[PDB]
Structure formats: C-alpha cells, structure tokens
Design a protein around this ligand. Structure first.
Ligand SMILES: N[C@@H](CCC(=O)O)C(=O)O
Length: 501
C-alpha cells in the first residue's frame, strides 16, 4: 500500500508536470505551482496527519504525459495532481481521485488562417503531445474519417506549442485550458486563437496506483473537503485570474549585505523581423540614508505596461501607463515612508545617457498612485532624436509606486527608504549586442518623487537591433487565463465525484 511505503520510507514522492499551465508547472524561479498542485500540497498535509509523521519529507519528481503511468506503476512516484484525464481505459492501469477539473479538447491555431474546425485539418500537419488523449483522438480521426493528417508528436505541451509557433504545424490539438496556458507563454499571445468543436469532454483526476483503496480514500476525502468548503474555487480564482508568473516577471530578493534589495530578470523586446531581443537585467538597490529600512522576503513585482504616443506631440517621446502589483506565488503601516505614498505623488524623471558615444537626454513627468499601483508618465528626448529604441529605456525610466497589498506591506523596501531615497543600479545586457549600465537616485525632494539617472551604453552594434532602431514599439506583459468557473465545475465542487466522463 502507498501509505505503508510512505511510512516506511519517511518520504512521499509527488509527481508533477513541467508546463501544464495553469495546473502544474514551473514558475520563473523553477518552483512548481498551479491549481492542481494545490491539491498535491493538501494531500501531502493529509498524509502527514494520517500517519502522524509531521516531519515527513516531500520529494518532487517531473513526469510527462507519456511516462506518467509507467513511473507510477514501478513506484518512482506515489501520486500526481496535474492535467491527467481519468478514463476507463486508464483505470485498468491506475486509479483516479475525485475529479478536480473538466476540459474540452480543441485546437490552437494562428489567426488569419483557414483552420476554423477539425474538418480543416484534412491533409495537414497537426502537433499534439505524446501519450495524451488528444493524440489518440487524432489517430482515430485519421483511421475513421480518412483525414490524412500528418501527426507530429512532441514530448510536452511547451514543445508542442513551439512547433506550432515556429510554423511547423497548422494547429496544436490539446485540452482547451492547456492551450490557453501555452498561448500565455507565447512570443505573441494575441496571434493565437482556440477554435473548433471540442472532440471530447474530459475529467482531470489526481493519479495514484490502482488497488490501493485506503490511499484513494484519503485523497478523495481531502479533495472533497477542499471542494465543498469553497477552497477549490479560491484556488481556481488564484491560478486562473492572476498573472502567470512564467515570462516577463520581476523577482525581488533581499540584499542584506547592502541593506537593500536586488533582482535578476529578463525583458523580451519584439524585433520588427519577428525575432525577440533579450535584455538581461541585473539590479541592486541600496538606501541613501541611514534610517531603518524593510528587508523583504522573496516576492514578485508584476508589471503591466502600455506604451503610446501623444497625437499633438512633435518631439521624440513615449507615453507610459503602468500598473505594478507586488505578489507572492505560493501554494496554500510598516514604515514611515509608506505613509508618504497614500495619495498621488508628482514624478520627475531625468536621464542623461551615452550609448557608444551618442549623447542624449530624456525628461519625464507624471504621477504615481501606489494605492492602485498606477503610473502615468510622459518622456521627451530633449536632445533630438533618441538614438536607441524607447522600449529599451522603459525599465530604467520608480518601484516605490508598486501596490503592496495589506498582507505584504512589511516587504516594501522601496517606500521604507523614503524620503531620503535609494540608489538603483542595473546592468542591462542585450544578447548578441551592447550593455547598458545605469545608476539612479530615487528620492522625495519636497513633494516630488525624483528619479535622476545616468546611463552608459557600450559595445553596441551600429547596425544591430538597438542602434539600428529595429525594435517594435510595444511591451510584453504577463497574462492571465481570464477564465470563469463554469456551472458544471461549481456543481461538481458541491457534489464531488470520481467518475470518468
Ligand atoms: N488530459 C489529457 C492531456 C493533458 C496531459 O496529458 O497533460 C491526458 O491526460 O492525456
């Protein structure tokens, strides 16, 4: 029995997925998260209570759609909660818990094309993940409907999507939620649409070994309680209505050696030829004054940025709208400076730059509303034509305006350093191109929040993406699933069941 194996070994081994978004997947920090993974954590805690082993160790191992049943049967892991369909054929090989979600198998395809339904796949190349129910359905469409599809089978859902994205398939067949999760990780999410009448409705269950009724009972009792108590719907909201923190994230950590914070993150700039220019950011902040500051636990700043133009503006310029929210990404006033940001605060930004000897200045003004995390700024190049693309300066051109929720205000270093302020320094390394070094002082001067920056760029290619002005005027934002919980799911959460559909 699995509970006997766990008790004897002092460990419970939890299988998990790499990229089943938003069910079980790695976030930007290589931590396993998602709606289904919440159940894994709850089941792990229920096992600790059942066995009265509060120090039980937890081992996470990655599985695929293809290897999940062999690795379960040979004891490599003990259970998994992810995106595995409960059906009668698989019940010959494994057991399933109460259902945790229901999906429909559809198609992801590029907009502007001719794939509107499954009938349009005739004679075409279609990608699917090896070892899935969709792979079976595609082969059945070939055998029974003479569709003559060339079926490309990829190792995991991210590999499947990237096959579609690169043009090597006309469509990706998969569970519709998983398709939306892969689209959210795309270079250009808005290029992709989910189409087609669903070929099946499928229930996700947590998978465990068969003929182990006592472990299945613990699992079902735990799931049914989470569902009937409302916690499952809270998990749905958490993982289906909040930014997916995989791409375009900002992860803040404490830099205690310097009484401040640091961050290491990646900005992806779209190139006008369809490629992506990586801008690797390393950031360090340290207080200007000697007063006490707040040193945070690890957390994210989730940025939503919109770049626009002012129609009545003849100078080279950028209008920037941003919403910035601090968040954790976990399963399952605090400074005097905080008080200085309860209203709307005028902002002044001054940047003096030199990229490959090309000297330029930027002046910005606007306001910050940290209660809502909202920034409105307009920047002008006061020296003429800006010699680099505006999107490359967005991150350089006031994290004190992030919205820290009530339960996280003890982690707001940026406001705690105010009014005396902080130094913000970055290296921005453009892949296959030059590097920005930036140094800013951010401080309250009277009632104005001032961001004064020096920027030094070196080693840029004069015909490259930056000095050659080949970057699109836009910005990548972390997306959310933007799904609502269906009536069918709410009825299931009221009356949990483990039935294949
Ligand atoms: N739910 C389907 C596809 C998703 C997956 O395998 O991760 C299956 O179990 O085959």
């Amino acid at each position: 029995s699995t509970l006997d194996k766990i008790a004897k070994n002092g460990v419970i081994v939890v299988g998990h997925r790499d990229s089943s978004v938003p069910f079980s997947y790695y976030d930007s920090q290589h931590k396993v998260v998602g709606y289904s993974q919440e159940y894994s954590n709850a089941i792990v805690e229920a096992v600790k209570k059942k066995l009265n082993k509060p120090d039980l160790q937890v081992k996470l191992i990655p599985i695929t759609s293809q290897n999940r049943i062999p690795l379960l049967q040979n004891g490599t892991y003990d259970f998994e909660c992810g995106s595995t369909t409960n059906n009668v054929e698989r019940q010959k090989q494994a057991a399933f818990s109460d259902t945790i979600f229901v999906v429909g198998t559809r198609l992801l395809t590029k907009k502007g094309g001719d794939i509107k339904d499954f009938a349009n796949l005739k004679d075409k190349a279609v990608v699917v993940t090896s070892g899935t129910t969709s792979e079976v359905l595609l082969n059945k469409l070939n055998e029974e409907q003479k569709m003559n599809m060339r079926i490309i089978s990829a190792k995991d859902h991210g590999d499947s999507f990237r096959t579609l994205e690169s043009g090597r398939a006309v469509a990706f067949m998969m569970d519709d939620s998983l398709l939306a999760g892969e689209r959210a990780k795309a270079k250009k999410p808005d290029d992709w649409e989910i189409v087609g009448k669903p070929q099946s409705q499928e229930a996700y269950g947590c998978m465990l070994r068969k003929d182990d009724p006592q472990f299945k009972k613990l699992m079902d009792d735990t799931i049914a309680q989470v569902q009937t108590s409302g916690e499952a719907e809270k998990w749905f909201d958490k993982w289906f209505k909040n930014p997916i923190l995989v791409n375009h994230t900002v992860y803040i950590t404490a830099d205690k050696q310097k009484n401040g914070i640091k961050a290491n993150f990646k900005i992806h700039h779209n190139v006008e030829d369809g490629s992506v220019q990586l801008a690797d950011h390393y950031q360090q902040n340290t207080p200007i004054g000697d007063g006490p500051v707040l040193l945070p636990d690890n957390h994210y700043l989730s940025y939503q940025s919109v770049l626009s133009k002012d129609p009545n503006e003849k100078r080279d310029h950028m209008v920037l709208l941003e919403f910035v929210t601090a968040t954790g990404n976990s399963l399952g006033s605090m400074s005097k400076g905080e008080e200085l940001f309860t209203g709307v605060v005028p902002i002044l930004v001054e940047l003096d730059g030199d990229v490959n000897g090309h000297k330029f200045s930027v002046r910005g003004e606007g306001e910050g509303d940290a209660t809502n995390g909202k920034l409105t700024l307009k920047f002008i190049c006061t020296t003429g034509k800006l010699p680099v693309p505006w999107p490359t300066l967005v991150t350089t051109l006031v994290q004190c305006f992030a919205r820290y929720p009530d339960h996280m205000k003890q982690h707001d270093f940026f406001k705690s350093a105010m009014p005396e302020g902080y130094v913000q320094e970055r290296t921005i390394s453009f892949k296959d191109d030059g590097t920005y070094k930036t140094r800013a002082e951010v401080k309250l001067e009277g009632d104005t929040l001032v961001n004064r920056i020096e920027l030094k760029g070196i080693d840029f290619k004069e015909d490259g993406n930056i000095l050659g002005h080949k970057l699109e005027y836009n910005f990548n934002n972390p997306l959310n699933m933007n799904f609502e919980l269906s009536d069918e799911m709410k009825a299931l959460f009221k009356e949990p069941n483990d039935k294949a559909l």
